[PDB]
Symmetry: D3
């Protein structure tokens, strides 16, 4: 194995086939991909987004960005709980920790508890992002990777298989990169993930792999050492 512990960042869109909502069949498919990774023996922490449920203050009337972001963080917790149940259906031991403390619903985020969960071969799903507005779960992925000592952030990005010279769904001439420096991402103004998540990984020397989780073998390949997707380092 190239990696013993990883942070897998997932789009909330992966929980539906139809753009919106939480759907059982899509959640099962996503669980099956995660179990494929779990079965390699890697230690697995996850950050889950909420694009399937909530886009932002465009949906509100007179809505601050902070308020819209809090709504989105609650949505990521909805997804976290749904994903945990799907993984438990496969018998994969799973815990959820949320960046907003909601005692009746899930454990709060507690570093020493997250570490013990990973050491006991459990998947830890992080809901709620970082708990702060003005981030996406991209930044929560970088932060939680650093907090659990993951060796790489695996960004399972919706509808792309890597980082491109441009948004490949707005420019068919876009070209995929094998490798990039953090600064190259910033200088070229690429919009594949929060620039704040880039700089957080930059400061720690934490590598990022952007890939297509629904390409069979891709996630297991990354874990086992294959070249897959785009490496930011």
């Amino acid at each position: 194995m190239k990696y013993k512990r990883v942070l897998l960042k997932l789009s909330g869109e992966f929980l539906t086939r139809n753009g919106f909502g939480i759907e059982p069949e899509a959640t099962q498919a996503l669980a099956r991909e995660i179990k494929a990774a779990y079965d390699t023996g890697v230690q697995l922490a996850i950050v889950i987004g909420a694009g399937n449920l909530w886009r932002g203050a465009r949906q509100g009337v007179g809505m601050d960005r902070a308020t819209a972001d809090y709504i989105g963080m609650l949505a990521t917790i909805m997804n976290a709980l749904a994903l945990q149940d799907a993984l438990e259906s496969l018998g994969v031991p799973t815990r959820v920790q949320t960046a907003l403390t909601i005692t009746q619903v899930a454990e709060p985020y507690i570093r020493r508890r997250a570490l013990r969960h990973l050491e006991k071969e459990r998947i830890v799903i992080f809901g709620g992002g970082t708990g702060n507005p003005f981030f996406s779960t991209d930044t929560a992925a970088a932060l939680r990777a650093l907090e659990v000592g993951a060796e790489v952030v695996l960004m399972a990005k919706n509808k792309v298989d890597g980082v491109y010279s441009d948004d490949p769904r707005k420019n068919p001439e876009a070209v995929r990169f094998d490798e990039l420096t953090y600064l190259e991402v910033l200088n070229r103004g690429l919009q594949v993930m929060d620039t704040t998540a880039i700089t957080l990984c930059m400061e720690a020397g934490l590598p990022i792999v952007v890939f297509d989780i629904f390409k069979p073998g891709a996630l297991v390949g990354i874990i086992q050492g294959e070249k897959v997707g785009t490496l930011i380092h």
Copy 2:
């Protein structure tokens, strides 16, 4: 004014026109109805549901009913926050209290903070139901009515204008009731609301009016003393 303080129970469906999501124009139209009631000078507490965002364990995989309920409670808080912004857009002073404590996002349910807010002519929106699974927001509406000393529960029901002999959406021949007793609702097995919400109001002699909030003038009518919808008492 017949009533000085009312609890208004709203379906989460009122925030969308397309089945799913939170939508600006639907939320704004709902806020305008609430503003008409507020402008009468009545004191106004609201309980909001989550059916525009979450439909229960049918959407999960191997999901407890309790877990589905906690996800719904999170969804009601998302709706409460969106509704608050919409009302504040219109200049209506509004507070949100949640049955689950989420410090950054809203204040917790605290009985005499809620009493003080109503006394200060603010709308109090209660998110999170009662904080317990195995209720709907119907029972949360009954509970919160008793807690704030509301004089009646105004049940704004999605797509009906009162209580009928049968589900009017399955039975075109159903007949509307002008009045019912609590026991009559239970013995006829009508499915307009939680039977638990029925008996809570029954134990207290707290009346319920089931009505159509989008019939212009209905809500303000009830507040002023007109006969609108079905009275359960």
Copy 3:
């Protein structure tokens, strides 16, 4: 064994023989009955009332019913802590969870900590009711039964051995029922328990047995499959 997991509802009066207080010998006698049921191997959750310590707003001066209810909830936690010590005296593994969060004193109600404790053959005593005013512990017993997946609610009622046509303490001519339906309880206006607790169990098809815990063998009888008391179903 007919039942694998039961919820046992206890009056706070069982902790005293003199109307008021918490008394060692009464608490110990109650703990011995609970130990007999535990020794059958059934999984056992308990909800405890507060009538030995608090009788409601009649004891206050200008006191809300909600405020009286919150005081009663505090009193149920006092009883839960006393009962736990008594059971631990007898070697019975016991946990206390409270509906109101009081960190130093007991763990908070958390649904799958409670599920894990029962799986580990510990008794879980729930203090604080549901955490909401306008319920009795009767409704808390119904709620907690549903939450832990109990198969029946065992209503140990103070000074009666079943449900009667009338209050047997006011009507010496009252007759005991072997069986009732939920609706029959409501329509006959019997005052054995919260009508809200009745309808909660009714909605779930959760049966209730009203019985005398101090009739030797009654509790263990019910657990083993004997006909004891009144079945509501």
Copy 4:
């Protein structure tokens, strides 16, 4: 006025005429004494005991002192809430802060909030003692006096009007002291209050007056400068 801000320590026994429980008439009488002090214009913080409800581990079976103390702290909060309602019945503005955080029921203890309450001419009742076992509310009285900057602790002791050379209810030859040093109290082994409360006041030079609150004029006299009871200094 001799004093601008005082801490009044009250026995839980003052809430009953009959040894046990909370009784409306006794609570009103106690409220009327407190209002007499309030009407002088002094700033008034209160610590309330629980001897009317809970004595200790003698009432438990296999009961630790710590557990018995937690039960007693919950009882002081019951009394605090009852006393607040009685004072509110007289129109005296009153707040309750508890050393155990119980959000739905009362404010948590927060120093800056307690100070603002006193500055706004409200009575603050402290329930829960210090939140730590192994104290009595005597020690909570000394601690809360220091925390709010009270100039004296007024110990309204049950059934005595001062400090005596011996327990005056076990030795009719006991003599009352006008004045005592902290060390004199310790050296003579007097049992009128926690020795820990003595030393806490010793270290701060905080004077203590032990007196009979039901002697008409006594409490107002202390506040206005008269010699009443026993001074420990």
Copy 5:
């Protein structure tokens, strides 16, 4: 006035003249500078660092960076409490909000409460950073600026009056910039602040002014519209 609401980022070092500790005369001197800016009428939010009290994991034995960062977050709260007292002793109304919830000590970070405080012309001091390890006080300054709608982040740098081509206390030949872009800071590898704080401001278009707070008139100059220090925008 050029700016109506600002976020002032301060080093923990400003609370000492001797490299380490909290010292009264330095804290008072810092409070007098803050009071001068308050006296312009600007709404003022502060983020305070910890360098006077804690450097990081090299002070620990086997200490991971996350643990060191939590220790520094505690230190920032220590400084916030000391700064609040100095400011209050000058009669400036001040509130402290902490990213880690410690009820007894200060109010939690709550965005709507912080907005009300600023509108009521109080200084809000933010302690605890963001509550997340791997985030710096520079990043907390950026975040809290966004959250309170400050128009600019004023980075009071220790012993430096702007951004330079190189660390000036390491290269006497370094040249100061009047103006830079966010990307210029990142590309030139400048170490004036956390790159994550840069990119957060970049994404919002929030301008940063790096300046020397102990150059008399500089802070007030920036507030009134003068050109002081270095503008990053």
Copy 6:
């Protein structure tokens, strides 16, 4: 072994050789002494002070003693976290419980959890004192000893090997006592520890041993039954 469970009170000064701060080699040296006592098999609970980081209100401007004490409580938690890391790096299983609840950083003080930890042969480090101002770490040592059922409080005094007739670093003619009573300490006006800590131990009959932890073999000596230091009993 004379003692099976002890409470070890340590000064914050033991974490530095230079009067102030947290330093790795002093912290490691302190951890090696603690590990030597752990290796005897005794169950070991620790209370840690703050003097290496915070002296009190003379470091503040207009700073009341309560605020200074909360600042010191934060410092004791900083030290607890650093001590836990040094101990863990020696392979000693260690848990931290804090009197102020800071979820992200350490578990809250919970008596039943602390007992389980000691029974599972873990060191429990108590940070935050008691959570109350005006209580000292000496008083916290006494309290936490009572709460965990320690058989003795071991007061590791800074630069002193027992109790003396006078402050020895102020009177070279002072004479050491082998033994004293609680009352002798109070009557002689000795300043070795908080008088409130003395009286708390007096009331429980809990013995105190004042000793020099950096006299090699002394801590282990006390645990194995030797006569070391001064016994207060």
